[PDB]
Symmetry: D2
């Protein structure tokens, strides 16, 4: 997370950390808990190639990475079948836990939006995670969960920005309809934040609008962050995840 600050303990009870086996169980992506047995993340974190399940774990909300880990094994990885790269789109995946978790005030699921929600500019939206704090800069120990308020920008405005300083033809769409754009040069998600949730308050309820997917660098001029638009993928998600 670039900009913003350390998140309070009481906030974002759905944030998860995905971990890959190595010298230690290292954080490589974010995720959100959307049901006690299911985590929603980005496909590019875990695909498109099939990886070994035993080498992946999940860690539910922690204020500080690594310090009191209790890692959770994963029984299935389901990746959107249209997924190949983040720029093509469909950058969405689900992890099913081997056991359901116990919800509580500090750990519980985020609500998905109804299909009709478009999340227009000036909706209040936050993004969270343990990723880099600027291009090339790692989050320092002790690795606090960070959060930042990001302005949503309409898709046609963001597509046109991505064409400024580019060779790509104006009628060749870079930002697609399954995508959502947010952030500016002071406030963006970054590497290590991928797979995490963009959430917006709507009628006093938190809704996950987006999944951190890609961008051109972090907080660069004319390059807002691009998120996978969850409304677009609800049917796919409900093929696997109960209501």
């Amino acid at each position: 997370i670039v900009g913003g600050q350390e998140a309070p303990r009481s906030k974002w009870p759905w944030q998860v950390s995905l971990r890959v086996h190595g010298p230690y169980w290292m954080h490589f992506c974010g995720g959100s808990l959307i049901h006690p047995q299911w985590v929603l993340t980005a496909a590019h974190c875990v695909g498109p190639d099939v990886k070994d399940l035993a080498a992946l774990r999940v860690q539910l909300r922690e204020q500080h990475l690594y310090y009191q880990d209790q890692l959770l094994p994963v029984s299935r990885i389901i990746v959107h079948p249209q997924f190949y790269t983040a720029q093509i789109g469909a950058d969405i995946a689900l992890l099913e836990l081997e056991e359901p978790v116990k919800v509580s005030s500090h750990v519980h699921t985020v609500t998905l939006p109804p299909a009709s929600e478009t999340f227009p500019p000036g909706m209040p939206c936050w993004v969270t995670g343990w990723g880099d704090v600027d291009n090339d800069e790692r989050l320092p120990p002790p690795f606090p969960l960070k959060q930042v308020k990001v302005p949503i920008m309409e898709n046609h405005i963001c597509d046109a920005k991505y064409h400024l300083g580019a060779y790509t033809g104006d009628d060749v769409r870079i930002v697609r309809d399954d995508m959502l754009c947010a952030g500016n040069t002071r406030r963006d998600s970054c590497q290590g934040d991928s797979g995490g949730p963009l959430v917006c308050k709507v009628n006093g309820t938190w809704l996950q609008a987006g999944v951190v997917s890609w961008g051109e660098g972090c907080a660069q001029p004319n390059r807002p962050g691009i998120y996978t638009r969850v409304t677009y993928y609800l049917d796919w998600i409900h093929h696997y995840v109960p209501k």
Copy 2:
């Protein structure tokens, strides 16, 4: 180039090296001289973001990079306007030299195929360059130009191989129709060979079939190298380059 060897000095008289200005004029990409004033290369070498022409030069065939440099400036870069990333396609660009090259036996143009030209499966083609000799292993000094023989493979077969050990649905196309596959787990192009030519000898003549574009690593199982198909872009090429 993976699994190849050093080229004879008489061969590949069309091969070029693109150089970016820093502490030295460093090779980043290959290209092919297709007309006295024109170089064919991959769009991803020089886009999609617009770059400064002063920071770019071209070097014609050299047995060993850096030794006997005579660097040529570029008057124009033309990136295909449908290009945004290699995996979406239109990974093709033209550089216009500021001056015609005086052609000779050591330095001359390669022939573009006719629109009708089908390079049948199994046909022996060759790819050349100064790229990595394996995954994350740089070409050692003195940077000899390497060459390797790679069989062409039908798109259908190549697409299907990219689906093996992947989550992408089998109906969802990875290798697109403006692309061509060639290579295997012993013989491939690699990073720094990008933009370089895939050439086949057809009816005793050398034709350029491909431009090194991308792949999943170099020489991995079921992940042949992927080339921009030059026949697909002949009319765009000839819109700028004299016939």
Copy 3:
């Protein structure tokens, strides 16, 4: 620490971590609290070149680096004046805290030996720190304090081992008389343990025998770790530190 394990929270109440200012207060060296206002460490951690005191702090015993930091400033660095490199010797320094530490059971001073104290060969001593767990392998998050039991070895034997597989003439001393050796190919201190304490329990009391100083790598054959011998520097220590 190579070949060791995580220390119990009750143990090593004198261990300290020195921190240098950058994007975070990063651990670079260990030390030992020998008096309420004084830390013993290795000169090579803070010299021979003069450094800025504002850029330096001290952290008292912590189970996991970075988590619960309460960083203490330093009023003075005193590097032994005969020090230039570790292999020549006098690798010993004092830091004077700006304030006395309020001592407790969790945080208290270690005892310096008497001048007469010979730590006989084979005696079991312990070394502690947050350094590398092998050659060029960092301590993984969450950075637990490690401990390891290392037998003391006579200088004559240690010197002779350093001569094996070396060109240095056998009459030319490598391990000097202000130094002490301990450790073997399974059990050693490593980079980032520097300045930390080698302690032995003698007649039921913990005495500091050594300061982690240098070695040829960590846990290599015939290259035991080398420590500054604290008895050699007692009078220099007591010239500054209250008895």
Copy 4:
């Protein structure tokens, strides 16, 4: 070499490159030819630990590293028996070739000084090699041999400079009598230049005064380069190398 420029082909016919086996025969140190079967270098290039002979080769004068290598195997490495680190001193070693080389105008030996020569300030001295061109900056391809004129400074002046900004006591000698100092903030040898020759013209004859040994960084304020003083080691050298 920091400062100065590319050496002319006709100059420094005694310069050698030492090479270590890896992905390619990589340059790690300089040397000088002092007899057709003997090369003089620094001990820290090849010691103090015994290395495998088969993994070391020598390359006689080349204008450009790597381009026309003809590597020469080594039958013995003789390191000064007092050697342990460069700061202690005796940083001098000899390599005996398996065959004698053929001398010529482009390749021949350098003359050693008579024991009486002290090389006082304002002697004209040059140092040469293929090392870094500033702190942390590699010599760029094509790797030309560089040379730089360096001012000699008297030993007591250089020792006092090395004490400025240091904790080391004024009467503790850093620069020793077997050492020689040369260079300033514009003109110095650097990493990769070690083992190479400092030569000075005296009565129209080139004499090797020094062997590039160590320094505090390269071209840093108050830290001239330190060379092993060859006059001091003539007897040792003549135990092995004929007149």
